[model samples]
Target: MISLIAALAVDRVIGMENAMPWNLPADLAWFKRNTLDKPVIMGRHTWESIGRPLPGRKNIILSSQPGTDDRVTWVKSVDEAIAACGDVPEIMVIGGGRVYEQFLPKAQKLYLTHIDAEVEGDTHFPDYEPDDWESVFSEFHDADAQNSHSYCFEILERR
Candidate 1:
């Protein structure tokens, strides 16, 4: 199975200059909790956005470099990246717009954090039909001193 993980603002804005515009610790922590120890596939730009491979997870980059590292595996395409996972139960597609849109149709589930605030951003999440997926779970959280915005964690499964 393939799952996607992303955080988007209410306006569907996801990135600004190859990085997230907002700083939300809880949302970042949620991403870590869900993707830990899983094979995470991302585009070259997304990898650059993070600056390094995430610790404790297999980082698969869809790029032509084909570089080898203790934590990173580079592939030329999405299929190659998924194929590299072999028998792994699920691979998480964590991305910057294009990668997410490319795999959206094939993704079995989506783990999303919906932020209540809007921002001016250069990247946005692609639009999808609501009927194609059903929200199986959702939890709302209010903004506090530590967190910058109110957000909701939602899990959607293809119907």
Candidate 2:
């Protein structure tokens, strides 16, 4: 299973308007393929972005905010969420900004969909050293009428 999953555009731009700057259905499919039947941990802002628990996956939110539904589990801290997963073989951290920054150190594997174009954005992916990790797998997709930008997905594992 994957660890940290995110989409970053040129300049490491990750968000605008609480979501990514572009829309690409293929990338969504890629995300779903990997996360299906797995538990996903997201920051509070990311929870707000999706607005509800994603179907077919256990939605764990790390936040102090209240949640009323049975589909989602709310935890107060990163440690709490880690414990909540409790004996799972892997955990996925779907982020906004703060959460990724916090988990970057502990992440053993990173799944990144890097778009080639640059655009204005308020949020950015956290900084990490390539030397600390090695790419285990990668694939490039050409931009088409449906996708606004050509993107490449890579899986990097800590070395």
Candidate 3:
């Protein structure tokens, strides 16, 4: 199964200079809780932004560069990445924009964090419509001392 995951601003900007433009520890925790022990697929750049293997999840990186190890599995294309997932019930497509675009068409569900404010960034999330999706879960989180912006965690399934 394919479920795309991301945190994007109102403008749908996902990143800037290959890093997060905003920080919300609550969202980070929400991410960990959902993806823990699940195989996650991402582009090489996304892996770099993360800087290392995520603690419990399988890291599948799609890149031409050859990297094969216990901690990380390298695949060259979207097809190869799906194959690398190896019979899992679901695979989360974590991204850096291009990867999201590649998998969004095939994904059945989306786990997204919508930040209230618009922010500037070079990378962006591809367009998809809520009208084409059915909301499965959603919760709004107000901005706190730690979280700079109000955000909502939403799960949507394709209609």
Candidate 4:
């Protein structure tokens, strides 16, 4: 199964200049723990945003380049990325706009943080219609309590 995880704003803004605008340690920890030891597929720009390999996980950078592994397995397409994973129990499709949309059709689950605030960003999550998914779980956190940020953690399954 493949799962996609992302953090977005009230307007579904995800990133600006190819990087996340918000800093939520709790979300980071949550993402790390869940994706640990799993194969993570990301776009070229997402790989550059991190600047280093995230330990305890295999990072696959999907790009036009192939056969380069100094930092990641360079996959040219979403199908190639999925195939390269090769029988792994799960693969996590981490983001950048293009990468997310590429695999959205096949994703089994989606983990998202819906921030109540609006952020000025250059990138946004794929516009998903309500008919496409069903929210299985949702946890809303108080703005004053969750590090002064209001967001809801939502788990959605493809319909």
Strongest candidate by lDDT: 3
Candidate 4 lDDT over 1-159, as tens digits, reads: 999999888788988887777777767877897799899999888888987788988888888855445766777788888888888998999898888998888898999988777788998899988798899998887766445587788899988
Q: Cα RMSD (Å) per model?
A: 1.4, 1.4, 1.4, 1.7
lDDT assessment of candidate 2 = 0.86
Clashes of 2: 0
- CA lDDT scores, all candidates in order: 0.89, 0.86, 0.90, 0.84
What TM-score does candidate 4 get on C-alpha atoms?
0.92
Model 3 residue runs over 4 Å out of place are: 68-70
State TM-scores per candidate: 0.95, 0.94, 0.95, 0.92
lDDT of 2 by residue, 1-159 (tens): 338999999888899889765888889999998788778999888888887779898889987867666678999888888888877777889897889999888889999999888879889999887599999998999998889789999999999
Could you give candidate 3's per-residue lDDT for residues 1-159 as a string of tens digits?
899989989789999889996879999999999899889999988888888889899889999877755578888899999998898998999997999999998999999999998778899999887588999998998999999899999999988
Cα lDDT, model 2, residue 131: 90
lDDT score at residue 27, model 3, on the 0-100 scale = 93
Q: Tens-digit lDDT track for model 1 on 11-128? A: 7899988888788999989999999989899988988889887999888888777565546888988788889987889889998799999999899999989999888889889898
Question: Against the true structure, candidate 4 has what lDDT?
Answer: 0.84
